């Protein structure tokens, strides 16, 4: 299986820089060009540029030429891209992609990297249980007052996926994010329910067992 793992999320001050990795398993690295794509919140894909690994010969979308630099450590089998002098308009998800021939197409995509540009401080989520006071029962966790996006939520360490709903984060008047994750179970009593919340931007990892 061809894979591209990207560095995790990123809070960044206006004016600052940031580098992003794309570690690349499962094929001959030097045999495939690598492209980078930006997607702004609720928006379309923009091509940033491509890079030949063999010789490091790059190729930029003129829109990004004074914003992005691409590079490749050929031993690490790892592509990089630095975005420099950042503003709120560089707030986006960035993807790395490998090109294939049959006829250029982007045939494998990384999972993306959420970069947020703000002068506001990191803040870890508080994690509160959601427990009730007719065929199913529901419980959940409230993941409150965190910055920036994103949080990951799993149940019983990835072993409960069915009936699970993790809502999209809402920005509160306070300027911090909040969401709930819920799971339904037909009536349960047998098993226990633990949410596992990971906020990479603050190295917060929190398990909350919901007393049923």
């Amino acid at each position: 299986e061809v894979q591209l793992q990207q560095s995790g999320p990123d809070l960044v001050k206006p004016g600052a820089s940031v580098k992003i990795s794309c570690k690349t398993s499962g094929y001959t690295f030097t045999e495939y060009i690598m492209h980078w794509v930006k997607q702004s919140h609720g928006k379309s894909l923009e091509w940033i540029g491509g890079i030949i690994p063999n010789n490091g010969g790059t190729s930029y979308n003129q829109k990004f030429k004074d914003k992005a630099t691409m590079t490749v450590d050929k031993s690490s089998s790892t592509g990089y891209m630095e975005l420099r002098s950042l503003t709120s308009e560089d707030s986006a998800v960035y993807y790395c992609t490998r090109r294939e021939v049959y006829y250029y197409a982007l045939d494998y995509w990384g999972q993306g990297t959420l970069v947020t540009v703000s002068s506001a401080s990191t803040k870890g989520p508080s994690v509160f249980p959601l427990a009730p006071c007719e065929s199913t029962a529901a419980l959940g966790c409230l993941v409150k007052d965190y910055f920036p996006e994103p949080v990951t939520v799993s149940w019983n360490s990835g072993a409960l996926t069915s009936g699970v709903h993790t809502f999209p984060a809402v920005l509160q008047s306070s300027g911090l994010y909040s969401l709930s994750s819920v799971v339904t179970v037909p009536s349960f009593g047998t098993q226990t329910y633990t949410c596992n919340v990971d906020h990479k931007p603050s190295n917060t990892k929190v398990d909350k067992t919901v007393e049923r």
């Binding site: 492209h35 794509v37 379309s44 894909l45 923009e46 091509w47 190729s59 979308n61 003129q62 829109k63 998800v93 993807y95 992609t97 049959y102 006829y103 250029y104 197409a105 982007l106 045939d107 995509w109 999972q111 993306g112 508080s126 509160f128 249980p129 959601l130 427990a131 009730p132 006071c133 199913t136 529901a138 419980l139 959940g140 409230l142 409150k144 709903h165 993790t166 809502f167 999209p168 984060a169 809402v170 509160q172 909040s178 969401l179 709930s180 819920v182 339904t184």
Partner: protein, 214 residues
């Protein structure tokens, strides 16, 4: 730069039906046109290259068509797992350019929500805020009225809503409504209730708890 226009950015369609997504280029691109599917979780997948060729492991009900400036992606008959945004991409010249996207809404039969209410935890209250959560699970369509009533007084301006993307298996939504109060306001009232109105309910469903019965 070659502009790719996907004029229809929001498209509804029924399970089993034919779906057509269209892309036009500002000038001819000689069939150098790819199609991507973005799932709601952000995962991107190449579907079709060079106008018409299916990628490995892509269902035979996807096909690509067109030439010059005008291209289409057709889903022969629509499955639930096709919920996604579809993007075209020209590689006729640099810089590579992308359509604005077409998001698929899937029409299915009406399903009413099942409704749940959660009081605030003591662990939250000790910090001065009370969040009261109302959940509407696995409903269709999207349109839902959620009213909060505190001791039977209709609430305004103190709640925020959030909705999942359509489920890839049953094409339903789930929604949360959160009522936020100060601890001090939370404690002036007994009965917390959310009342739900939806096409699949013959009359509104109310879920409630008494503060200090829990």
């Amino acid at each position: 730069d070659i502009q790719m226009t996907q004029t229809t950015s929001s498209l509804s369609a029924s399970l089993g039906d034919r779906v057509t997504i269209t892309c036009s280029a500002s000038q001819g691109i000689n069939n150098y046109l790819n199609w991507y599917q973005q799932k709601p979780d952000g995962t991107v997948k190449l579907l079709i290259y060079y106008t018409s060729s299916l990628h490995s492991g892509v269902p035979s009900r996807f096909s690509g068509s067109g030439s010059g400036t005008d291209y289409s992606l057709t889903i022969s008959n629509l499955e639930p797992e096709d919920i996604a945004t579809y993007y075209c991409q020209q590689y006729s010249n640099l810089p590579y350019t992308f359509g604005g996207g077409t998001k698929l809404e899937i029409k299915r039969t009406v399903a009413a929500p099942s409704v749940f209410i959660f009081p605030p935890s003591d662990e939250q209250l000790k910090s001065g805020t009370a969040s009261v959560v109302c959940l509407l699970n696995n409903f269709y369509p999207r349109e839902a009225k959620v009213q909060w009533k505190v001791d039977n007084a209709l609430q305004s301006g103190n709640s925020q809503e959030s909705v999942t993307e359509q489920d890839s298996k049953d094409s339903t939504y789930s929604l949360s409504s959160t009522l936020t109060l100060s601890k001090a306001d939370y404690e002036k009232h007994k009965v917390y209730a959310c009342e739900v109105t939806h096409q699949g309910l013959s009359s509104p469903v109310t879920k409630s708890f008494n503060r200090g019965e829990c």
